[PDB]
Write a protein that binds this DNA or RNA. Structure first.
Ligand SMILES: [Mg+2]
Ligand SMILES: [Mg+2]
Ligand SMILES: [Mg+2]
Length: 820
RNA sequence: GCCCGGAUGGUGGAAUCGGUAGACACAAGGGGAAUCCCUCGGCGUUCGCGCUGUGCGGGUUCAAGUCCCGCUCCGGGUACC
């Protein structure tokens, strides 16, 4: 065993071992319990950032841990390889998106391997390859045939392909209740995004107008407070008035281009319940695309109605009582909360629900209103006018008819060998490309490409069967691996990717491809990585941001930063810990830290510094701390093994001191197990390891028994660290002569006999304040404990000439003397 | 505007059915570039501890960081639906 811990001489060798033995390659083995650990796949931008490194270390800890529990563990990696940044970079260099993307993939793959992530590399997928994307093309034609796909022109105004995500709104919404191991925050974000709303449509007669106008409201209870209506710029009534009104027409034209603003339509509606004529405005805040593109306005109780009404001198009418039953102060703003009606005729005194229902019922029976459920969720627009994405498998015949690309022309291959002219997709600018023949007649194949969210919506599934032809999924394999047991990635994907992949899963279920409703049991959103951020003010008044690496700080007598400078001598202002970024120049390159300290130190720091789901504060000093710890583990194993083999441990003949150390070993095992497997607090797991290492470093190692005990502890410690720092642990395991490769060694289980106490610490309070802590035989009786407490000078001091009124006793733990 | 989080030493961050607050680590200063034995919330100390202490106020309980009421401050999403 080398005396010196040398990451550079260890890490690449173990890594090569992992590849040579294919250690982390798995099959669909029905005789084992499966566990699918998934991290969100990276975009091949060029290098890993610190967030990839946190995301994938978390995944790797879990995958290696679960393997040591004896599970069959799938941990796959791949590349979300289509998308915009490649087009930018293709043009910026003298190049094409594909070769730039493949270069980034090789470079980043080598970084992942240098970090020693235990992936099943045989399952590796890159989404820009025809072998991957042909399947989403095929599935898209199937989706179209199921009636879930349609073309339509829309804002972004351009034609687009949509997939009917609204056909699954209620399922996406209901099934959120099945997801207890998703965080509330992500669930609430998807709820609001889907935005199912229960309301009322209300129809008005309009003077000098040969239609009726209908609005949608979620607060029909406030309808007696309605003083005007507001319609979207692009509403048929708004257009009918503009015909004779240059002001209005001017306004409508504005509302397309680049904040309460509107115009008086000149039309008057009759309020169906008061008979009063009310104005109709065109207004900027009203979406033509939602509901009916028109609202009834109630300034007294809708904040945006309040602002609009004030601006244009429209009536503000109160109809909701305050929470305390008093008529609302509307001098400043609207009363938003739902309360009892007043000033609403027949509906006065009704509470919120009763009023909602009475007014709905009334307007229904009058035939000018009905209940109506709307959704904020729009259909999913999957089309882009972009080159670097998977072609959309549709064609147009000469007769005009749109249909899917015939099965025998799939995939539709994106040509990789192209030259970007910056502005037009090569497959657009060459009018030859589109030309095809369908049933031996000329057709034009679609020229738009898929939204990149298309590939990331089903990759997690394809990982189960990456080499399968015949179909998108081999069901047997997919149903074996799915659902994902834990999915680790950022909360920022909450209402894009994390919604799309639930939807796509349901689409694949409903094509018979899988047999479960939800793609992922647990979702873990890891916190952001923060770093210190500094800037100075140039003599031009411009803020110049200086990397915290480049900052020379100086500290008071307690270590607070109080003054700082860069090398050039500028005065820096410390702005605290902040999200890593190019704007603030506080990015840290993981590769530099891997090359400086070895991957194990980097990984250990990032798991130690902070619970997975909280923000992590990057500190060079914490990293050097982690590194020194690893040297202390290396040293203690060096010293222990330098003395050769050990006798078998005799557990019956241990000193009270030995029993105590061994109890601490096994309690640590229990605690680390609980922390990693149930609580998922990896920071406290690691702290328990360090704490134990500190004790082990202080224990004697001369006697045969001390050495046997040290062997047992080191074999446990080395396994406990292994999911965090597997390169050093793999090596140390061999030094200790552990059986086999550590990657397939069993996770240590705590020995119950080792955890038994002969003694217990009893905390002694007097009137609830700690006056002593006594060690007593583990089964001492309450009388024995009391007697011992009263023999303590520290306690007796507070019993002297005062009377014990009563005692509270928690067996073997606490005695409080109430006195007196 | 809501939706949660949160607030504990000089800093990060513990405390898992209320029962030894501050584990673990960093900074820092100090003793014997790298290493080990310490010390370390505050005040006081006869070194045994005493008082005080988890954002402020109050309640509950023999006992509150942890439960309940009310403040004050703060981070991060996110809206004309
Ligand atoms: Mg924690
Ligand atoms: Mg504080
Ligand atoms: Mg506790």
């Amino acid at each position: 065993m080398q005396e010196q811990y040398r990451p550079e001489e260890i890490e690449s060798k173990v890594q090569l071992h992992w590849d040579e033995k294919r250690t982390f390659e798995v099959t669909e083995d029905e005789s084992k319990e499966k566990y699918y650990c998934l991290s969100m796949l990276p975009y091949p931008s060029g290098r890993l950032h610190m967030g990839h490194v946190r995301n994938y270390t978390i995944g790797d800890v879990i995958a290696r841990y679960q393997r040591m529990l004896g599970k069959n563990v799938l941990q796959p990696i791949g590349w979300d390889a289509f998308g915009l940044p490649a087009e930018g970079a293709a043009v910026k260099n003298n190049t094409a998106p594909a070769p730039w993307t493949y270069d980034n993939i090789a470079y980043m793959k080598n970084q992942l391997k240098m970090l020693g992530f235990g992936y099943d590399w045989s399952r590796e997928l890159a989404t820009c390859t025809p072998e991957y994307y042909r399947w989403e093309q095929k599935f898209f034609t199937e989706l179209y045939k199921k009636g879930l796909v349609y073309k339509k022109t829309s804002a972004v105004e351009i034609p687009q392909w949509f997939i009917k995500i609204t056909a699954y709104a209620d399922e996406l919404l209901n099934d959120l209740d099945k997801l207890d191991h998703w965080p509330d925050t992500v669930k609430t974000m998807q709820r609001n995004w889907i935005g199912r709303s229960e309301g009322v449509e209300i129809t008005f007669n309009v003077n000098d107008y040969d239609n009726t106008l209908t609005v949608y409201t979620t607060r029909p209870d406030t309808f007696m407070g309605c003083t005007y209506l507001a319609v979207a710029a692009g509403h048929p009534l708004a257009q009918k008035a503009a015909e004779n009104n240059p002001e209005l027409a001017a306004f409508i034209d504005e509302c397309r281009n680049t904040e309460k603003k509107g115009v008086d339509t000149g039309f008057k509606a009759v309020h169906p319940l008061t008979g009063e004529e009310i104005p109709v405005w065109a207004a900027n805040f009203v979406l033509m695309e939602y509901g009916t593109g028109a609202v009834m306005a109630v300034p007294g109780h809708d904040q945006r109605d309040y602002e609009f009404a004030s601006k244009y001198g429209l009536n503000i009418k109160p109809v909701i009582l305050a929470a305390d039953g008093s008529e609302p102060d509307l001098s400043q703003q609207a009363l938003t909360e739902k309360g009892v009606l007043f000033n609403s005729g027949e509906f006065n005194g009704l509470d919120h629900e009763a009023a909602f229902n009475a007014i709905a019922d009334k307007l229904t029976a009058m035939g000018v209103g009905e209940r109506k459920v709307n959704y904020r969720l729009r259909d999913w627009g999957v089309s882009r006018q972009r080159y670097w994405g998977a072609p959309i498998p549709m064609v147009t015949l000469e007769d005009g008819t749109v249909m899917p690309t015939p099965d025998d022309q799939l995939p539709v291959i994106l040509p990789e060998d192209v030259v970007m002219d910056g502005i037009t997709s090569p497959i657009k600018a060459d009018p030859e490309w589109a030309k095809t023949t369908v049933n031996g007649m000329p057709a034009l194949r679609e020229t738009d490409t898929f939204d990149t969210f298309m590939e990331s919506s089903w990759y997690y599934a394809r990982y189960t069967c990456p080499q399968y032809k015949e179909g998108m999924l081999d069901s047997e394999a997919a149903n074996y691996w799915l659902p994902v047991d834990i999915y680790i990635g950022g909360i920022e994907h909450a209402i894009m990717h994390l919604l799309y992949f639930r939807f796509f899963h349901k689409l694949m279920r409903d094509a018979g491809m899988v047999n479960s409703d939800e793609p992922a049991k647990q979702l873990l959103c890891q916190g952001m990585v923060l770093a210190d951020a500094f800037y100075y003010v140039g003599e031009n008044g411009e803020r110049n941001w200086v990397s915290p690496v480049d900052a020379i700080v100086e500290r008071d007598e307690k270590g607070r930063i109080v003054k700082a400078k860069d090398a050039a001598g500028h005065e820096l202002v410390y702005t605290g810990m902040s999200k890593m970024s190019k704007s603030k120049n506080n990015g840290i390159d993981p590769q530099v830290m891997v090359e400086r300290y070895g991957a194990d130190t980097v990984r250990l720091f990032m798991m130690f510094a902070s619970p997975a789901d909280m923000t992590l504060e990057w500190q060079e000093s914490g990293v050097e701390g982690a590194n020194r710890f690893l040297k202390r583990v290396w040293k203690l194993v060096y010293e222990h093994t330098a003395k050769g083999d050990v006798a078998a441990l005799n557990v019956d003949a241990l000193t009270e001191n030995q029993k105590a150390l061994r109890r601490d070993v096994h309690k640590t095992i229990a605690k680390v197990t609980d922390d990693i497997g149930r609580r998922q607090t990896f920071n406290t797991a690691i702290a328990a390891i360090m704490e134990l290492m500190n004790k082990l470093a202080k224990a004697p190692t001369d006697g045969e028994q001390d050495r046997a005990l040290m062997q047992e502890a080191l074999l446990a410690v080395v396994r406990m660290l292994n999911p965090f720092t597997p390169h050093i642990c793999f090596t140390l395991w061999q030094e200790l002569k552990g059986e086999g490769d550590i990657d397939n060694a069993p996770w240590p289980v705590a020995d119950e006999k080792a955890m038994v106490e002969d003694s217990t610490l009893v905390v002694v309070q007097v009137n609830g304040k700690v006056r002593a802590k006594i060690t007593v035989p583990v089964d001492a009786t309450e009388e024995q404990v009391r007697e011992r407490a009263g023999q303590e000078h520290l306690v007796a001091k507070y019993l002297d000439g005062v009377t014990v009124r009563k005692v509270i006793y928690v067996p073997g733990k606490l005695l409080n003397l109430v006195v007196g």
